[PDB]
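Dissemination and training. As part of the outreach component of the grant, students in the summer workshop were shown how a complex can be specified as a set of sequence lines and then modelled as a single object. The example used during the hands-on session is reproduced here so that future cohorts can follow it. Participants entered these lines:
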Amino acid sequence: DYLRELYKLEQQAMKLYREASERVGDPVLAKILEDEEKHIEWLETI
Amino acid sequence: DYLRELYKLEQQAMKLYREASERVGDPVLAKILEDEEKHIEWLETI
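and obtained this result:
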């Protein structure tokens, strides 16, 4: 259901937030990434 | 660049987190949504 494509969305966000952090180099980009990580965990409880 | 498709990703996440919160009804789903919102704002400073 939703959870499953919401889960994948979180995975792409981390992938593209990773390729973006490497380059851009805005520390807040790394901050947004620590979050997406926790979103995955919380998603993991439904 | 990345920022632009990272921005759109955040928009879809909120759209699908909204349709998912309405239904599922897991309060943490609303918590993940208040976040995606701030990610948009922080994204807005690059």
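The CA atoms of residues 7 and 44 of chain A lie 9 Å apart. Students were then asked to discuss how this feature might be tested experimentally.
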